[PDB]
Amino acid sequence: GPSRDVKLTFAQIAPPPGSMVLRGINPNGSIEFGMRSDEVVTKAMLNLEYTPSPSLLPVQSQLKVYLNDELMGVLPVTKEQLGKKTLAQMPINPLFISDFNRVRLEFVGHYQDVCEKPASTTLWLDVGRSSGLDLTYQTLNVKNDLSHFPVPFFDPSDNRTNTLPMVFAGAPDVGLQQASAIVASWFGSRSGWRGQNFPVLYNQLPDRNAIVFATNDKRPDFLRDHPAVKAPVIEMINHPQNPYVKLLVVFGRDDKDLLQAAKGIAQGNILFRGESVVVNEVKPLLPRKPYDAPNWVRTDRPVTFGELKTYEEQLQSSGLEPAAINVSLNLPPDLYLMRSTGIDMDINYRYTMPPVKDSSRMDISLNNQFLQSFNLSLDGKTDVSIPALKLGATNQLRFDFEYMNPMPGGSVDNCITFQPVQNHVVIGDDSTIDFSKYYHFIPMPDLRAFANAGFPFSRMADLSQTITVMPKAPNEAQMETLLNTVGFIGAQTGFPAINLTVTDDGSTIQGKDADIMIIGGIPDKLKDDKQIDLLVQATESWVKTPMRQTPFPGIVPDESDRAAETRSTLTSSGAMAAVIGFQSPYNDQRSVIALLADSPRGYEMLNDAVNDSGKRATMFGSVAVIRESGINSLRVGDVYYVGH
Amino acid sequence: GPSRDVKLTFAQIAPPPGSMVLRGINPNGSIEFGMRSDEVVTKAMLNLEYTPSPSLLPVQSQLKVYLNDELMGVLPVTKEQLGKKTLAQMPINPLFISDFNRVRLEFVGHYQDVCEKPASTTLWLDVGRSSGLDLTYQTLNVKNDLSHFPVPFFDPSDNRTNTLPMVFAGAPDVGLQQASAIVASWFGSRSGWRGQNFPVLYNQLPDRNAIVFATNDKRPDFLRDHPAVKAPVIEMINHPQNPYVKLLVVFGRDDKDLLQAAKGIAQGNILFRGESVVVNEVKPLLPRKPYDAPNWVRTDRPVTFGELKTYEEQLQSSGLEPAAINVSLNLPPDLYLMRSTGIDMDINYRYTMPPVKDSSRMDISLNNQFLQSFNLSDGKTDVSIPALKLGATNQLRFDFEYMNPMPGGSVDNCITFQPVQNHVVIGDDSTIDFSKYYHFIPMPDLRAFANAGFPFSRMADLSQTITVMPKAPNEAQMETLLNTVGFIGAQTGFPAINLTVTDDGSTIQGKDADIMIIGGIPDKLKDDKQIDLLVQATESWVKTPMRQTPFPGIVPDESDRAAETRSTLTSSGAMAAVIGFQSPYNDQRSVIALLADSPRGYEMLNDAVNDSGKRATMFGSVAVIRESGINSLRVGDVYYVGH
């Protein structure tokens, strides 16, 4: 079977800073990696480029490698490697590996053997960011059972961006488009932060796990002599060229049957069994609530920290120096602070009584911004008022415990020291955080929330109040960008779009209360609003520039730094994509976000910018222009507030 | 491609104390540099001529060399070189170099082993300012794509002056002059504090990247083969001799199309695509308000610290000794307060609560001068800044001075530990009022012009600004015009797009706008009243204002600033005269004249206007720039601008 040779380095598995330093207080460095439970590793090796300390002793210092609680090897320090950068090759036995492994490097060092100062900064060993673990994956044969779903298509263990191409049969219909969008949104919600890309190709066949859409009419070229189905059925067959890649052929009589199948897949994914699964009836019971997403916190009532734990071992730490506890809480980017009172949180922290009252403080930080420090000299219910002014869509709350332990040293001749004792730190699980007093009222025309959270469309979980307009007979690129943006919206939230509406005519939205989404060409029905700032055409394009451009604006905007100063029009022969956001001419409380290109290369740029989270989270303002030189954003046009 | 050896001394890249000392509380010494993004660094080595402390332990004390959090090598101190001067060269791996690199040196020291105490002045390692980085840049070939604009001409990762020569077609008319001035203003505004220089050549291709201006009738050299165009196009072609340098060719049917192309390049440059960009329609919607410049602070509303960061972690610090938090305020030089109460600001600082009140404080200072102090024993303090040094640019520095009352045990039992760090943060919500001021100042001086360009930069777009130029100017006068326009544009944050370049004095008669004389003073001017330093290329006369006292009062006096003697003399050298006076047509408008007597004088004037060290030392109403520097004096009548 096929076997790839991936060589992951130390710059994408190690902490953000990269090169880690192994001191005496934190001598453990862990890097995590896993396989998709289908491919088997072979010929795995670890290359370490470390530079020991010139002070530590040669033989009494060593670097231990632990794959999973098993010492794979021990590299000692020699007299020549005392202060020189040395390359060490460590073999990794491909037998103790599992679905998820954490290679842990532990460094022990001793510079003095008589009166060594524990936790001294003279001893250190830092691995280089050029290190890497080279391992080859070999693909095995899948059992071909729909019970394991979506394991063969999408495995949550893989950290690489999910690549799931969808193959239509050319010129999708109205129902087929919305069903494919539902499936893509479900896959994006299943993926999450991993990032998802759906390369769509018509009447072709890739060499990767794909999804084949069939409706008993306009079937792909290779779905020949297949019997018609009475009800929507989902069958998992193999590729005819090679049996080492599994497809997903969804069937149905008409577009409505395929939509029912997609709804059953997105919702009833827990009843999948065997190989073929027939859907017969799917009906809801009650609608969803606004601003209610599984990934977003509950703003209606205070939520405990127990509902904000990714793993059970998040709210506890140990060791000579207790590490900082980091918690993530996603919330909608509509929190507007009116009374400047902030949020009130009660932290029920339990700590260790220090030997002396030396103020082993504890600090709370929000996005690397110190909020307040509490003395430490044992649960305490403190009412912490957070002066929150930069609460966006995603943040990170850090509780650090700066422990300083005085150790009796004695005198010059009477050198006596004590080894450090480990301190246990735990945050109270009953601790709560309140977000009820925060209101929902913000400037609408900004798309920073759209790129970070998708707020304009993600008002409700199932996207009921959203209408996406598509051009007649879409090509590959238009459907590709549609699927990509729908999957991104679904991943930013926690629930897929089940009640989304797709239309091919631009006059069908006249008189409806919904958020309009333009994917291809802006229809002439609403193009006359003139609030659309940047328009991309075959070769011409005109943009409007504001009066003042500030890198960091204030909390409340002003009508003086957003008015269009000059309008510049020009034409060229290059590629350029545009992301614009304006007010709908049919309602004063809804918005329209349009992603538009002109050429296939522009669509490719738009897809590369939307799929990747590095280039997408760097846009703000009202308008964004994506070109070969990345993406440039500007805040032009009048501002209109949304909310109450 | 050509290789240029570069030696960056430690003086021009480190903070301006000259040298850096690495103590036990501040062992981090940082050095920032950048890469042009179109060149690759090869054979980079770091030299260090440092002195350690003699009380250091030889093996248990070393220094690191981190390049973007990557240890290139560690240097220990041997017993023989414990107190002596130590020179060491370390090879730097060019693979980890990026657009903006920060080399941080960390020093670890241990003078004792059983009872060593931090914050002690017995252990130290100081690097002299004789060291520097030795690296050889190697240019590459860009993709010739206009989407990366103005990347090949101006990179935000550079630190040296941006020399951008502009090749015209010879004897440019008013339209070409105005277009070149607009382009130079835009480039200077994009550059900013990096320094701007715009040499001009006629039918001479330069070595560096340049901009070519064409008209389809007076075609310059090496462009006769290019076919005629139907509309103003912007194309970036390669230099025929050496392709590693790029030239920006601007075409147009006539001067009006060239001006339109320049206006489009200035404003509509965010959507350049591929190559040969055709600009057709560039029209404005509404005019610009006075005192509306991006770099200058907004006076219509109270301004917060969020709009004055220009950074990400400027309002916060950490470590044992929290570094000072500096915020720069760029105010216009036209500010007058009769109430004399001073501007009030609402500081919302917060800090780490120390264990016991030990008189740890925070000092707020302005222009490197102590202003106020607050004890740390989390607030909305109203601080009234006395307006005594508020000029055109300043620096507001909050320095959190701490001292930790850490115990040390008894004489027979000394305790050991590691000192804890403390974080400080101001918060991007502290506002400062600036609407309680008026715009009324006596303006015969040149300090506001040299520092901010006030009389001409009242409107960021230079709408009411008339610059005269001689008939068929040479390279020197055009260079002077381009340089002064670029400087005015860089002091502000908006390109001068609506400036008016004229050639005859008939347009000056009956027009409400400031005057900028470059070539020479016209006949209607230089009436020998309120005008000094008339240089007829042979002799010159200067007036002494009866007194020359450094550091005058805030409000100037009229008894001292009065002409006493008119000394006339003929010489054989070269001089440049900067003269500021009042226009006879309008009382509010003013006339600034930058003139020279000889080509060497024009060169000295261009050099003075280009740099910034010799420009900040210019004040008064008259400035004479000779081969021995610039000397200024305040003479003439006083006229007030403002209501």
Numbering used by the authors:
A (entry chain I): 68 to 444, 463 to 729
B (entry chain H): 68 to 444, 464 to 729
Question: What did the study's authors say about this model?
Answer:
Phosphoethanolamine (pEtN) cellulose is a naturally occurring modified cellulose produced by several Enterobacteriaceae. Additional subunits include BcsG, a membrane-anchored periplasmic pEtN transferase associated with BcsA, and BcsZ, a periplasmic cellulase of unknown biological function. Cellulose is a common bacterial biofilm component produced by a variety of prokaryotes, such as Escherichia coli (Ec), Salmonella enterica, and Gluconacetobacter/Komagataeibacter xylinus (Gx).
Although only the TM regions were resolved, the subunits were located ‘in front’ of BcsA near the periplasmic exit of its cellulose translocation channel. Taking advantage of recent improvements in 3-dimensional variability analyses and classifications implemented in the cryoSPARC data processing workflows, we reprocessed the previously published cryo-EM data (EMD-23267)20 focusing on the BcsA-BcsG complex, Fig. S2. Interprotomer contacts within the BcsG trimer are mediated by TM helix 4 of one subunit and TM helices 2 and 5 of a neighboring subunit, suggesting that BcsG is prone to self-polymerize. The predictions reproducibly suggest the coordination of a BcsG trimer via BcsA’s NTD, Figs. 1e, f and S4a. No direct interactions are observed or predicted between BcsG and BcsA TM segments. The BcsG TM helices fit seamlessly into the opening of the BcsB semicircle, between the first and sixth subunit, Fig. 1e.
